[PDB]
Design an enzyme around this catalytic site. Sequence first.
Site, PDB file in Angstrom:
ATOM      1  CG  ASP A  10      -0.814   1.673   1.422  1.00 45.48           C
ATOM      2  OD1 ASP A  10      -2.449   1.931   0.807  1.00 45.48           O
ATOM      3  OD2 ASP A  10      -1.510   2.053   3.029  1.00 45.48           O
ATOM      4  CE  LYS A  71      -1.286   7.616  -3.896  1.00 51.38           C
ATOM      5  NZ  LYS A  71      -1.734   6.295  -2.084  1.00 51.38           N
ATOM      6  CD  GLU A 175      -4.611   3.544  -2.645  1.00 41.92           C
ATOM      7  OE1 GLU A 175      -5.714   4.642  -2.375  1.00 41.92           O
ATOM      8  OE2 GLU A 175      -3.243   4.138  -3.351  1.00 41.92           O
ATOM      9  CG  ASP A 199      -9.115   5.307   1.846  1.00 41.68           C
ATOM     10  OD1 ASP A 199      -9.032   5.384   2.720  1.00 41.68           O
ATOM     11  OD2 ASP A 199      -8.443   5.424   0.636  1.00 41.68           O
TER      12      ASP A 199
END
Length: 385
Positions: A10, A71, A175, A199
């Site tokens: 992850d 990211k 994800e 999330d």
Amino acid sequence: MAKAAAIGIDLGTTYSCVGVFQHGKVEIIANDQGNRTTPSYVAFTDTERLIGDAAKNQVALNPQNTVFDAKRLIGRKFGDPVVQSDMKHWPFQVINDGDKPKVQVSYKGETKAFYPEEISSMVLTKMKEIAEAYLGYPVTNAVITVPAYFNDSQRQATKDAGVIAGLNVLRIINEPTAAAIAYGLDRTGKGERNVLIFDLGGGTFDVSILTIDDGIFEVKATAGDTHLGGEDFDNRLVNHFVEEFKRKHKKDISQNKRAVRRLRTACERAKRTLSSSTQASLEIDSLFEGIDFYTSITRARFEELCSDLFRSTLEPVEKALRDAKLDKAQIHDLVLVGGSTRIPKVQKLLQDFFNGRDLNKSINPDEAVAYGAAVQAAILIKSTR
Ligand SMILES: Nc1ncnc2c1nc(Cl)n2[C@@H]1O[C@H](CO)[C@@H](O)[C@H]1O
């Protein structure tokens, strides 16, 4: 042995997590400091390069050469309005190398520039070394996760980060798909299953709606706030304590960078205590001008401080339902992902919005994505033989 082994990674914006599926169970691998998640930070110092917890621990002393949020840059062009808007908020330098962003730092006394995939590859190398120290042999096969809204350019740059790190990337998976795999939601037999993944991480909020039809996953909708997370709740606690310090001592601490950072780390810790206790204590020795800050906060006051932020998480849930063209009763499963979903008020608001429905939350929400990636990596490596 090593060739028949595969890990699940992850690769998050603020934290990364690595898992391995062996002997019928998933093991989320602790780093050498015993933490099951590692900060996605890379520090460049006068003597070394630090990755993870050690990089995050010295961010105050070295802000210009401590990289994070790579990211947010991966697979993007320098001219992208997202990049230009984000650059104004980072303490490190972002430069333009042929319409591609590079992070410019000072390392061992020299000026060096890195592509976001090179920064992400250093985090990936650390995750690979954490798995290698746990297993006792090098593991190279990996499943790496990405947000469901990542385009082809972002997915390709993540696979390239994996190649630079010495990993054989088995697959780049979404994800929310890894999270649904973790709960075995693709093994309910026949019939289309509608799953909502809520999330809430450290710096981002994502809502994903998936349809699982006979093992096949389909993304119906993605919604959210790329600039909403756990760090916003910490700052709300910080502002409260700065005003409380001012009422008790008639002194403003907001300009003292060291006092604010110590208050911030303590607020993050107290926020985590408020998830299982109805009160938390702050014990900061000599916070400002020799004054100790020993106070407490209830979960009720914390919920008041973040009330507007918690309620704002339901607008993307409504938006994702309308885009997916589904009513609430049409959603079969609700899955919690991210450490911030541990907050009791967040769970209560989501459960009430879904008419008192039970939530899937038995897997550590900051570990569920790595868990599912590790399951997929085991299935993929077995089929490869
Ligand atoms: N027990 C907790 N109660 C509240 N927030 C939590 C908790 N654990 C984590 Cl991690 N977070 C936060 O989740 C993010 C990482 O996924 C960070 O913002 C962390 O503080």
